[PDB]
Structures are given as C-alpha cells and as structure tokens.
C-alpha cells in the first residue's frame, strides 16, 4: 500500500513550495491522480484481505473508504477556492497541508494491520480537524466547538487505549488477522463487560448516538466549509471500521450487552429525526439527519448479521456522500447570503434553476429511494433488523417516515415558493459549485450501478 | 470609537469585475486552467476510465469463478443422487465425539 | 419542547458536559486559591506526615 500512501506524503512539499497561485491547480490535479491510483485497490481476492506488508493491509471493507477519502480530497480542495482566496499565501499552503495530512492519516488508519497503530492514527485525526475548525472558523462559538469535539473524542478514546494495551498483554498480539483467527469467546465475567465497554464506547463517541451527540451539531455548524464535509464524511466512518474490526473479539458478550445502546440508537434515530423537523439552521438540519443515519448504521453493526454488515458498509459510503453533498449546498447558500438561517431565503429555484435541481437529487439521495445505494444500504439493514427482532420495523419505519418530511421540507422552504424580497445580491451560480456537486452526485449513481464494490467484505 | 478597525469589506463577485470568469480565482487565465484540470480527470478518466476500471475489474471474490466451478460439483453429486448441498460441511468422521 | 431545547439544548448538555465542567469549576478554586502563607502550607505538610506515618501506616 506504499503505492498510494507515498504519493500523498510526498505531495506535501509540492503544495508547500509551489507558486502562490498554482498551488490550488497542482494540489487538485495530483489529488485526482492519486485517487485514480486509489481506485485500483477496489480489487479483493476471494475472501483473503488484500495484504501488502507486515503493517499495511486492506480488504473489501476498507477499499471503498480509501477511495472515498482520495476522491473527497479534491472536493473540499476546490470548495476552498471561494473561502480562502483572500488569505495569505503561506496560510493557504498551511491549510492545504492540514487537508493533506488529514487524508494521509485517514488512509493510514484504514490500511492499518495492527490495532494500536490504527488507534494512534485514529486519534491523529483530531489534530488537523481541531486546527481547521478553530483557526479557519467563522463565528464565535467555534472555540467551544473545538473544545467539545476534542474533549468528547478523547474521553471516548482513552478507555480504548487502556483496553488495547490490556488485550496486547493478555492475548499476545493486536494484529487484526490473528485476533480474528485466534478469537476466543468473551465470557460474561464482570470484568468482560467493562472490557467490551472500553472497546466499544470509544468508537461510539465519534458515531453520535442519542445523548452523546452534541459535538457534531455544535461543531459542524461553524466548521470551515471544506472541513465540515470532511468531519461529516469520513471520521464518523473510521469508528464504523473500528466496530467492524473490534467486534470479532467482543462476541458472544455482544449478544445481550448491546441492548442498552442498541435501542438507544433506534429511539435515538427517531429523536434526531424528530428534532429534525424543527431547525433554525440548515447546517444543523443536515447534521441531525446525519446523526439519524449513523444511529441506523450503529444498529446495523450491533446485530452482527452479514446482511446488517452489508447494509452498514453501504450506509457509511452513502451517508457520507449525501451529507457532504448537502453541506456543499449549505455552504453555497450561506456564502451568497452570509448567514445560515433556515427560512431566511425560500424559493431559490426562481433564481438558480440548476442549483435547486442539485438540491432535488441531493434530498432524493437523502430519502434513500431505489435503486440508489442509499436505499439498498438501508434495505439490507431493514431485513437484518426484521430477522433480528420482528417489531424493529415499527421504529425504523418511523425513521423512513421522518426522513423525507424534513428533506423535502428543506426543499420547499429553500428552493420552492418564492424568493424573499429583501435579498438582492444573489448572483448566478458559479460553475465551481455546480461542478463540485456534479462530481459528488454522478459517481453516487455510477458506483450504484456497480454495488458489489461497496457491498461488503462478506460477499 | 472603542478600537481602530477596518470595516467589513464587501464580498466581491468575480463576474462583476471580470465577466466570463468561473468562481475559480482572480486572474482569468488560471481560472481557465483550473476549469480544464477539474473538467479533466475529475470528470475525465478518473470518473469514466475509472468507471471501466471498477466495472472491468478482475474476478470479484472469484464469484465469476465460483459460479462455473459449482455446476460441475452439482452434476457430479446428482449423478449418484446425493444432493447439491449437505447437512454438514466439515466431515463428522474425521472429528471425534467428546465422551 | 421535548426533542429540541429540553432534551438536546437543556438536558444532555447539562449532564455530561456542563455538570463535569462545573465540577472542575468548583474544585479548581478550592484547590488553587491558597493565599500563600507558609504556615498553613507547613501544617499541610504536618498532618500529611502523620497520615503517611501512623493513620494509614504506610510502613505497616
């Protein structure tokens, strides 16, 4: 996996030394090319994980997330063009350095072969995200945003540190393959449930579940437009990879211990959907819908079902794409209006004919309608949860009952109706935006046509 | 006065000073160049030749292989009537019964 | 009144973030507000000497 990591690491001096205005161009081009190299990794041999070295390995679970991150890096890269055109050249290169280091640490996490290295790079993501959120933020509460995000993630992570060093001392190794192959039944001992809690709560923290979901709403709102999509897109899914890999040792104790959090997700995905009918900010709207989708993926994980795993694996990719998709639109409207109020500007279709079209398929993908991979990822979870506990379909039906009520509500109160008469600075949509949502939505259906790749590693 | 500040600057739009621009930068020629590069691999070979790459990837989990190699097993076992499946995958005989 | 405000913006933020931050509040000013008199510091050394010596009986 040096093939894709080394280009990213060595790309850094290019941005840090190139000319004051070619840095955007060169970073964009080389990001598209290392993403090109990345999609060659979609190959997965039989059931064997694609091994590369003693420290780096990948599989069908990893590959979609890897090529995801490589595909995004250009997206916030050229989304940053508007918001960073007026700041100093050295700060521009530093911002690009932050993004590149973030992507590097992501592809390091996802290819990790041994647990504690995955953990080191798992916490290595906060530093770039914290820097991006705090420095290049816009409003005042961004400082408390960084505090909440950093402290929440750490307070989750440290128990996982103690648990992992304990696993290494006891079992003998933390390599993924061996602990899957040398797995043993985690008994119902009173130390074992705290073992499980330490190995689970860390990932649950950066997978906002009901109750412990304040950092995302209070950080994504005023995070920089480029950063916000990165938080909402990937770092909620590295935790999902964490569950995907750590649940191989947490059985069979997961059978009955998962129940408190399990239901805390289903009712949770209703409340964060129920909260989602009433938001004064569009960014908070997308954040709460995202929280609902991650509660869905959480209950997908905790059942331990191959169909649940497939629905999850599809759901991380689908939700990340759609969430960043909507966040781009929120950025565009805010930047034109220099505010983030919900009902400030309705009826934008009367001014930007193609922008509300983008809004339309963005919400439609948020709807999870067939045959989009959002629907198929949800549907596998529907089937798994039904086979789990019969009635679960009632609560999850309430979720596929609220999702569109808020998604299309956002359309009717942003794009449909008529423009508010006071605002008059809304110019024609620049090709940068509509181009970026084009590169966002078209591959969303392209890989929908080929769902095997993102379907899951249990295929 | 309470502080010596520069007031909030007006957020210029590129089209107003420079029509035919692209919301990409101030100098038009690199506006064009950024257009070409993003409308390159972004929508070009990464998006399309990449689509063929993922679509025309080698055997996925040997499913295309596992398809062909299983009708032969089916035929072999229906020849003697033993069905396409079995109750046990691992063989009872080689594994001992405890007590 | 139940999903928003009272639950998200009142309750959950009160329990984990604000209550723990208030604990650190109340225990940072009772920990780091000593006047600077050598006496009371030295009697803090004093009672610690016996608590280490006989009360806990570290040596035993």
């Amino acid at each position: 996996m040096l093939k894709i990591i080394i280009p990213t690491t060595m790309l850094l001096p290019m941005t840090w030394m190139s000319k004051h205005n070619m840095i955007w161009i060169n970073a964009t081009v080389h990001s598209l090319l290392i993403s090109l190299i990345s999609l060659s990794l979609l190959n997965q041999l039989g059931e064997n994980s694609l091994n590369f070295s003693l420290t780096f390995f990948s599989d069908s679970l990893s590959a979609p997330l890897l090529v995801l991150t490589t595909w995004l890096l250009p997206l916030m890269l050229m989304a940053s063009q508007s918001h960073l055109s007026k700041e100093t050249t050295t700060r521009k290169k530093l911002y690009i350095t932050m993004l590149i280091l973030l992507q590097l640490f992501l592809i390091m996490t996802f290819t990790a072969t041994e647990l504690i290295l995955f953990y080191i790079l798992f916490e290595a993501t906060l530093v770039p995200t914290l820097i991006i959120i705090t420095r290049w933020g816009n409003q005042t509460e961004r400082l408390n945003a960084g505090l909440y995000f950093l402290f929440y993630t750490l307070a989750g992570s440290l128990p996982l540190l103690v648990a992992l060093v304990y696993i290494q001392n006891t079992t003998g190794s933390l390599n993924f393959l061996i602990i899957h192959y040398w797995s043993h039944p985690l008994s119902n001992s009173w130390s074992n449930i705290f073992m499980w809690l330490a190995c689970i709560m860390a990932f649950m923290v950066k997978m906002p579940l009901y109750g412990l979901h304040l950092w995302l709403p209070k950080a994504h709102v005023e995070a920089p437009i480029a950063g916000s999509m990165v938080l909402a897109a990937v770092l909620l899914k590295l935790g999902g990879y964490g569950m995907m890999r750590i649940t191989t040792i947490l059985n069979p104790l997961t059978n009955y211990m998962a129940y408190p959090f399990l239901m805390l997700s289903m009712w949770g995905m209703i409340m964060t959907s129920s909260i989602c009918l009433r938001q004064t900010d569009l960014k908070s709207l997308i954040a709460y819908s995202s929280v609902s989708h991650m509660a869905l993926v959480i209950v997908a994980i905790m059942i331990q079902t191959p169909w649940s795993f497939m629905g999850a694996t599809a759901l991380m990719i689908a939700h990340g794409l759609t969430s960043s998709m909507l966040f781009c639109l929120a950025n565009t409207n805010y930047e034109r209006v220099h505010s983030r109020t919900m009902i400030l500007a309705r009826g934008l279709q009367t001014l930007l004919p193609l922008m509300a079209t983008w809004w339309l398929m963005a919400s439609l993908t948020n709807l999870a309608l067939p045959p989009s991979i959002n629907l198929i990822g949800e549907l596998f979870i529907i089937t798994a949860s039904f086979s789990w506990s019969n009635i679960t379909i009632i609560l999850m039906g309430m979720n596929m009952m609220i999702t569109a009520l808020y998604s299309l509500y956002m359309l009717i109160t942003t794009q449909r109706g008529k423009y508010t008469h006071h605002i008059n600075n809304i110019k024609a949509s620049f090709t940068r935006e509509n181009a970026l949502m084009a590169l966002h939505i078209l591959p969303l259906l392209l890989l929908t046509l080929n769902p095997k790749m993102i379907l899951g590693p249990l295929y | 006065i309470r502080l010596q500040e520069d007031p909030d600057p007006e957020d210029e739009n590129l089209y107003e000073k420079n029509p035919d621009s692209h919301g990409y930068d101030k100098d038009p020629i690199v506006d064009l160049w950024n257009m070409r590069v993003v409308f390159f691999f972004g929508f070009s070979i990464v998006l399309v030749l990449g689509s063929t790459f993922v679509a025309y990837l080698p055997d996925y989990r040997m499913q295309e292989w596992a398809r062909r190699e299983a009708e032969r097993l089916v035929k072999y076992r229906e020849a003697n009537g033993l069905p396409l499946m079995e109750s046990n995958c691992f063989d009872p005989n080689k594994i001992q019964l405890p007590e | 009144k139940s999903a928003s405000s009272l639950l998200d913006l009142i309750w959950l933020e009160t329990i984990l973030p604000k209550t723990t931050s208030f604990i650190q509040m109340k225990m940072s000013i009772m920990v780091s507000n000593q006047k600077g008199l050598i006496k009371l510091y030295f009697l803090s050394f004093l009672i610690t000497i016996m608590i280490s010596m006989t009360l806990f009986n570290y040596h035993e």
Binding site: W136, G137, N138, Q139, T140, R142 | R2, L3, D8, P9 | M25, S28, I29, S32, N33
Partner: peptide, 19 residues
C-alpha cells in the same frame, strides 16, 4: 470575514485568575 476575539473576549481572562 470571520470573527476575531473582541476586546471583551481577551478581557475575560485578565484579572489574574480567569475562573
């Protein structure tokens, strides 16, 4: 532009001890 700390935002620390 973004928001930078006002004079009051620096003032709240001030005061020897800020809590």
């Amino acid at each position: 532009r973004q928001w930078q700390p006002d004079v009051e935002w620096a003032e709240q620390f001030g005061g020897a001890v800020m809590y």
